[PDB]
Short mmCIF file of C-alpha atoms and ligand atoms in Angstrom, two decimals:
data_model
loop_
_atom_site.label_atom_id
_atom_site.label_comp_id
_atom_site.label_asym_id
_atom_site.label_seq_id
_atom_site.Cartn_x
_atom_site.Cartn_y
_atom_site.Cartn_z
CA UNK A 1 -24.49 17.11 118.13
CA UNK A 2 -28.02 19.12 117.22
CA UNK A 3 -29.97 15.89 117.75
CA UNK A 4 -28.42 15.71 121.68
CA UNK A 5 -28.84 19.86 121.96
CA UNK A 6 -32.22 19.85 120.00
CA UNK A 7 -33.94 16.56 122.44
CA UNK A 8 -32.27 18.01 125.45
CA UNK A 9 -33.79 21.47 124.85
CA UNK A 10 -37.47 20.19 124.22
CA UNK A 11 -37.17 18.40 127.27
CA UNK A 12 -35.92 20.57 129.68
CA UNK A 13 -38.01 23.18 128.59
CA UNK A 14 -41.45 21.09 128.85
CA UNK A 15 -40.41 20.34 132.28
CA UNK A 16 -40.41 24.23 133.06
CA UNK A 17 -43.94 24.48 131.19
CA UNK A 18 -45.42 21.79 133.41
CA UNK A 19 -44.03 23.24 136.23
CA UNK A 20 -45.37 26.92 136.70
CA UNK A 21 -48.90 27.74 135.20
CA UNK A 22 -47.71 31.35 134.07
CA UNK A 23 -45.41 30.54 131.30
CA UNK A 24 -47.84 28.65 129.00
CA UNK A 25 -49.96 31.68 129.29
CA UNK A 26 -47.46 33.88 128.42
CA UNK A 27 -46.50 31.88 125.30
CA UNK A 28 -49.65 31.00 124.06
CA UNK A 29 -50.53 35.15 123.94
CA UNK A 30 -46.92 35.18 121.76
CA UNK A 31 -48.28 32.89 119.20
CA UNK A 32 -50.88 34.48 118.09
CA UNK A 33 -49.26 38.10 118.31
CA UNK A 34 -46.99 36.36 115.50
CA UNK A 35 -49.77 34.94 113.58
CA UNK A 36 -51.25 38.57 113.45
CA UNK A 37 -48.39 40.08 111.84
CA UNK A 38 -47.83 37.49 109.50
CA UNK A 39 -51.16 37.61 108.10
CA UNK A 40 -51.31 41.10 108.11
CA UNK A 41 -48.11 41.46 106.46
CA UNK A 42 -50.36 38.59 103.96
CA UNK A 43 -52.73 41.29 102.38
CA UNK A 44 -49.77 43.64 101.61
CA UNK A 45 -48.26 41.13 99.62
CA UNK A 46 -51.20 39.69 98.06
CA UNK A 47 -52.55 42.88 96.51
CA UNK A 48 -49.40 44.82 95.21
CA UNK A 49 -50.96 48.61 96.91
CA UNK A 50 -48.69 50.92 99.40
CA UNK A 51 -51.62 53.75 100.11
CA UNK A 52 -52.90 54.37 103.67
CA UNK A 53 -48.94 53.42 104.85
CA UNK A 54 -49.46 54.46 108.41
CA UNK A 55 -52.26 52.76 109.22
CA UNK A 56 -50.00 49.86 107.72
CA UNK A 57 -47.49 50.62 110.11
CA UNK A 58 -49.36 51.14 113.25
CA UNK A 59 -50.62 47.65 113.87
CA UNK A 60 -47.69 46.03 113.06
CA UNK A 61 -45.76 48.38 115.23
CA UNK A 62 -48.69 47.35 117.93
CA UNK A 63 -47.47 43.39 117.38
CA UNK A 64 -43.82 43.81 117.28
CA UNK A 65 -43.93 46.18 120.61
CA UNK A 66 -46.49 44.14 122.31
CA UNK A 67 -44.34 41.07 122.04
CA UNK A 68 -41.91 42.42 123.12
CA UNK A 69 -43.09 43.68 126.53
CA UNK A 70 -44.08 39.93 127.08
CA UNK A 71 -40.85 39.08 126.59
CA UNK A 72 -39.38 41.26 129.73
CA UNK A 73 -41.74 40.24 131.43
CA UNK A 74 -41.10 36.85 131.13
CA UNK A 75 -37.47 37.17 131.68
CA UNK A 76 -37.93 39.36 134.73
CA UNK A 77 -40.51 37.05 135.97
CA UNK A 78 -38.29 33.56 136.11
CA UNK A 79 -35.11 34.99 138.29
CA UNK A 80 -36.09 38.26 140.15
CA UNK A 81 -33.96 41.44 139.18
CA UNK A 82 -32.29 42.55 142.56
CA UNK A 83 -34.15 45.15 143.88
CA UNK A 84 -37.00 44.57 142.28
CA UNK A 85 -40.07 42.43 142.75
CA UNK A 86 -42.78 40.79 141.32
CA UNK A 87 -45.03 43.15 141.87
CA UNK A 88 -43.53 45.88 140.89
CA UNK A 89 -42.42 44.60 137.38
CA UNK A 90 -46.41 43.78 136.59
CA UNK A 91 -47.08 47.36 137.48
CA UNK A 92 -44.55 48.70 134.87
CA UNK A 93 -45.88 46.04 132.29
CA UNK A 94 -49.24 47.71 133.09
CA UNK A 95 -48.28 51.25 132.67
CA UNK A 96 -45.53 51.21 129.60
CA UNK A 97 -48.03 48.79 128.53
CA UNK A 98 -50.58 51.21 128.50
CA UNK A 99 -48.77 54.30 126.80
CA UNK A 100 -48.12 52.09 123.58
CA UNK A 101 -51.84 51.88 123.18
CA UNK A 102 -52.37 55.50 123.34
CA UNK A 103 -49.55 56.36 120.90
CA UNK A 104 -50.65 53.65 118.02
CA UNK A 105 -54.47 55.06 118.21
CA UNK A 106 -53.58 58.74 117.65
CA UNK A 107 -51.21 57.35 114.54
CA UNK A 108 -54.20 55.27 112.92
CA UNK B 1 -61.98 118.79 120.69
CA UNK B 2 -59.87 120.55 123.25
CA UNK B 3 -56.62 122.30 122.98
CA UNK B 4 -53.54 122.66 125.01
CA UNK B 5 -53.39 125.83 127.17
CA UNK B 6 -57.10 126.42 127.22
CA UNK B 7 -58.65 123.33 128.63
CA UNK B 8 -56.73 122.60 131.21
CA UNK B 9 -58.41 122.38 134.45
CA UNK B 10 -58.85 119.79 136.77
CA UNK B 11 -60.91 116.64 137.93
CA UNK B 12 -62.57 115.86 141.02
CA UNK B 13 -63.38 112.28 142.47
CA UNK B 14 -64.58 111.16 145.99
CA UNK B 15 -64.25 107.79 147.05
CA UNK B 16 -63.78 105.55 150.87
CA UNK B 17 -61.24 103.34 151.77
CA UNK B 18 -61.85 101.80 154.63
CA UNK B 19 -59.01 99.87 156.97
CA UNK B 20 -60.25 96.52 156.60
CA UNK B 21 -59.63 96.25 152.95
CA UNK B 22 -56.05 98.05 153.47
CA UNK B 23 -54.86 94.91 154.92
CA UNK B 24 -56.57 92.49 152.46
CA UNK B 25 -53.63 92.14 150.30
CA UNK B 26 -50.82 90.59 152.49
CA UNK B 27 -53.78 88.13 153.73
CA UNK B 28 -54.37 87.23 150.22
CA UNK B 29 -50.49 86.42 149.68
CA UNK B 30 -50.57 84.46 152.94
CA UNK B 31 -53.69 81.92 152.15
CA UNK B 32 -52.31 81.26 148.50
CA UNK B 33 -48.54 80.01 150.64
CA UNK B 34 -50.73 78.52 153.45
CA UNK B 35 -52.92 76.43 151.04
CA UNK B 36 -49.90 75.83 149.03
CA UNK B 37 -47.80 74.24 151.77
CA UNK B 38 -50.71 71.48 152.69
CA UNK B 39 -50.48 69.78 149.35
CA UNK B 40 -46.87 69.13 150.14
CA UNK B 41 -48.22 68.00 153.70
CA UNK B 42 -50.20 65.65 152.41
CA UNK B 43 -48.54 64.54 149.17
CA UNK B 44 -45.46 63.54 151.22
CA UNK B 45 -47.01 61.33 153.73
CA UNK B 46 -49.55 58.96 151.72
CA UNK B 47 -48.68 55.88 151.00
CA UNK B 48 -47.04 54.43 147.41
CA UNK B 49 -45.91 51.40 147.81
CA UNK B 50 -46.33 48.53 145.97
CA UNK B 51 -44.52 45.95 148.30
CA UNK B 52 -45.57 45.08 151.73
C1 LIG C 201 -44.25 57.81 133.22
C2 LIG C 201 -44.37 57.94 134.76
C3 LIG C 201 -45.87 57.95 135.18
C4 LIG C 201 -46.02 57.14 136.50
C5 LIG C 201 -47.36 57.47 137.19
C6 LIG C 201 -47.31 56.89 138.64
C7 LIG C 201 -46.29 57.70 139.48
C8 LIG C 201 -45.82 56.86 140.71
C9 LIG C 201 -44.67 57.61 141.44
C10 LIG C 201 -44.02 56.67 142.50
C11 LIG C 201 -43.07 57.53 143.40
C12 LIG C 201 -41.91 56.66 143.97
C13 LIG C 201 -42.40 55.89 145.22
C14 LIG C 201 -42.38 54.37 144.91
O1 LIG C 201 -41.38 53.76 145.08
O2 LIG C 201 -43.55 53.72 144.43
C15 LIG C 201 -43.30 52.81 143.39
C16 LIG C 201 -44.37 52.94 142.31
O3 LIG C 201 -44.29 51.82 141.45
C17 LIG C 201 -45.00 51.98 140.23
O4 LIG C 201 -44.44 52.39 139.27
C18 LIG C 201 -46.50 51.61 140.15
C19 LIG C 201 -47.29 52.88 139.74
C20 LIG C 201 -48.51 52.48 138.90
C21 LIG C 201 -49.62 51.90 139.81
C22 LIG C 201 -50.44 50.85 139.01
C23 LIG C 201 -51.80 51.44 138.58
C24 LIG C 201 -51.77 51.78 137.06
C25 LIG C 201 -51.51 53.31 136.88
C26 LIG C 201 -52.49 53.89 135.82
C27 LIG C 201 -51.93 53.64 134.38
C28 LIG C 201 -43.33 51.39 143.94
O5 LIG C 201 -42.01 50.96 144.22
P1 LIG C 201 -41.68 50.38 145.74
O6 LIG C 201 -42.90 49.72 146.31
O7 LIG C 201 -41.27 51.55 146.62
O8 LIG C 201 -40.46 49.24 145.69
C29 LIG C 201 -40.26 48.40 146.82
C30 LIG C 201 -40.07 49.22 148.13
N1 LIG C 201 -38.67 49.68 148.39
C31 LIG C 201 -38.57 50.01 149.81
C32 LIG C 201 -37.68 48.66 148.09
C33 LIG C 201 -38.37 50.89 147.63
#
């Protein structure tokens, strides 16, 4: 069962990798927004101290909510939303984008 | 130091007025509404689209 699901899904999603030369970009910028949390979750757990806890909190908000924004625009950028194009949901990315960045420098 | 029914009296000031600056005020109402009504002239046609 799994082995026929698991094969089936590697396959067809390489073929949509290799197809369009947005979605590799897309998912190699995910990667490494997970690899920063889970290191910087690392030095939390490594030394047991709790003190400057928002600037704890403010780049690992920064990772969760900037992954997430790559994932709607992902989603939105395979099948169109009707009414909307695609280049207005790059435009939103840029500005909702842009208000995160603002709010996670005054909390630091 | 002056008291009630004693100091009294009165004071005296000359001073112009002259007809060009009695109808100063209305004009000054009007040019705030006139250069208030050209922002919405040109904030309404300007173009915002992101589509073609
Ligand atoms: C929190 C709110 C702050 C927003 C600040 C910008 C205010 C823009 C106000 C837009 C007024 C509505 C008019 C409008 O529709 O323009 C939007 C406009 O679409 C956009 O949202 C793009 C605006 C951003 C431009 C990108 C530059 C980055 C801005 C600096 C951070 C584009 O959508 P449309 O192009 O109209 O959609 C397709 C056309 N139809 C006919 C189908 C409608």
């Amino acid at each position: 069962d799994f082995q026929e699901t698991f094969k089936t899904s590697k396959r067809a999603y390489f073929a949509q990798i290799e197809k369009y030369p947005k979605l590799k970009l897309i998912d190699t910028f995910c990667f490494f927004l997970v690899l920063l949390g889970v290191i910087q979750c690392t030095f939390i757990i490594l030394i047991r101290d709790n003190f400057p806890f928002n600037a704890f909190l403010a780049g690992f908000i920064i990772c969760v909510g900037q992954f997430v924004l790559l994932m709607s625009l992902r989603l939105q950028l395979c099948n169109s939303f009707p009414g909307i194009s695609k280049n207005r949901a790059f435009a939103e990315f840029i500005v909702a984008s842009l208000i995160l960045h603002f709010v996670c420098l005054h909390f630091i | 130091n002056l008291i009630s029914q004693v100091a009294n009296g009165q004071v005296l000031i000359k001073y112009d007025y002259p007809k060009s600056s009695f109808f100063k005020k209305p004009l000054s109402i009007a040019c705030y509404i006139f250069t208030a009504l050209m922002g919405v002239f040109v904030l309404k046609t300007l173009n915002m689209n992101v589509t073609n």
